[PDB]
Design a protein around this ligand. Structure first.
Ligand SMILES: C[C@@H](O)[C@@H](C=O)[C@@H]1NC(C(=O)O)=C(S[C@@H]2CN[C@@H](C(=O)Nc3cccc(C(=O)O)c3)C2)[C@@H]1C
Ligand SMILES: [Ca+2]
Ligand SMILES: [Ca+2]
Ligand SMILES: [Ca+2]
Ligand SMILES: [Cl-]
Ligand SMILES: [Cl-]
Ligand SMILES: [Cl-]
Lengths: 243, 242
């Protein structure tokens, strides 16, 4: 029923001297939960979490033929050392390799990008800036609860792209697996336009249920980046979702 | 070509056991093993047959997809995890035999045999009962024949739909972290001597995949964790995982 606040989760933010929101959705029970109902609906730039729809679109249109296709380094040295090599969809996702996804966006084109985001009902559906950086510094915006809504369609293969493309993106989202749970998720870090924030959105697969999640948090500097996952799983342990 | 590495035997004798580990570097097209004869010895697949059984069930529509629930038939059985409802993901993770015995009966002897010929799976022999031939019938498969089958699956080149193979590989997911992904399936063959345990699958890296297939003697069920334990120590020794 509706969305419950639960500001006790704030203690793991203040624990690590931080402020942000965490939003969970129980798929069996169709109930929501968050430490901050109003930050849950604040729309921000998606930054690198835009790689989920951008991969879906690129795959649906044939810009990416499969998760094995190699995407050649263009030769510019960039600060994140892992970007300066060849990549496929899996590794490009894993290392949030932006130049590979900018090339996808150029090849997709503004018209086909905008059409597809409307068909996804993705955030505010506005791609106002340049075609290869609007999700980093242009007009698009999405809330935490709007991330969940999108992810739920992807889990059920209900987005208007091919089932095969959704399966592949779901394979590429794989982050962690063990006897107790599977995590498919994607990080982000919006630096170009204030407020500097870091994202983590995905879902937990259990034997018998699925818990979707989406968090964001103030990220003045790059050294607090690990608290995106770390805090989220502290919430997850508290609600006994993961051991 | 195939290289023998007897130093791996330390991790078997560490644990009062004997068996074979087989590794295949996909980038370099070279395999390795601690025992070349055992590597090519054919045993019953036991529950590693759930990989092809799943593929045929999905390709023929016996299973719609990975979320379709399979009803507990009521009967209580030794392994507690079996006595509940399952989908494909959990039926594999817990090796729920009754669910797969049901798949096989609906697949039928004819289609099951045609598929195993098209998979070139082991000795391609399904003599015995429709619902148990992989436990106590005629089918046999070696560690190196498991590798060959799994490489086709990795590349989607088995004579079934791409969708089927993708789904089965999702269901094979076992472990994942920042360093590696293991997709794999266990087995434990007791109905016919020699009693043995299986672990077959592969390790995905950023830039390579290592296929593995191991089996070991398994006199009691208390050694079953050695399947993963011993494999992982070979992988550590070969610097495939940290
Ligand atoms: C024909 C079937 O009856 C037989 C087919 O090969 C079943 N398949 C399996 C199997 O595992 O393949 C089992 S054993 C049971 C389920 N899996 C074991 C396990 O995960 N054990 C486990 C898992 C993790 C750690 C440890 C340990 O000993 O430390 C042990 C416990 C069944 C008898
Ligand atoms: Ca805490
Ligand atoms: Ca050892
Ligand atoms: Ca043959
Ligand atoms: Cl990006
Ligand atoms: Cl089975
Ligand atoms: Cl997967």
């Amino acid at each position: 029923k509706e969305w419950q606040e639960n500001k006790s989760w704030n203690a793991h933010f203040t624990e690590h001297k931080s402020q942000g929101v965490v939003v969970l959705w129980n798929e069996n029970k169709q109930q929501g939960f968050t430490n901050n109902l109003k930050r849950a609906n604040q729309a921000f730039l998606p930054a690198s979490t835009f790689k989920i729809p951008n991969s879906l679109i690129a795959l649906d249109l044939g810009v990416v033929k499969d998760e094995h296709q190699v995407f050649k380094w263009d030769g510019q040295t960039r600060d994140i050392a892992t970007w300066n090599r060849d990549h496929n969809l899996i590794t490009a996702m894993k290392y949030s390799v932006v130049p590979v996804y900018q090339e996808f966006a150029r090849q997709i084109g503004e018209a086909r990008m905008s059409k597809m985001l409307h068909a996804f009902d993705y955030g505010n559906e506005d791609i106002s800036g340049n075609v290869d950086s609007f999700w980093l510094d242009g007009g698009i915006r999405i809330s935490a609860t709007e991330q969940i809504s999108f992810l739920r369609k992807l889990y059920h293969n209900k987005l208007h792209v091919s089932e095969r493309s959704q399966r592949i993106v779901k394979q590429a989202m794989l982050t962690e697996a063990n006897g107790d749970y599977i995590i498919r998720a994607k990080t982000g870090y919006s630096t170009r336009i204030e407020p500097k924030i870091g994202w983590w959105v995905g879902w937990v697969e259990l034997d018998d249920n699925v818990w979707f999640f989406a968090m964001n948090m103030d990220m003045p500097t790059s050294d607090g980046l690990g608290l995106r996952q770390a805090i989220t799983k502290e919430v997850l342990k508290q609600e006994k979702i993961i051991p």
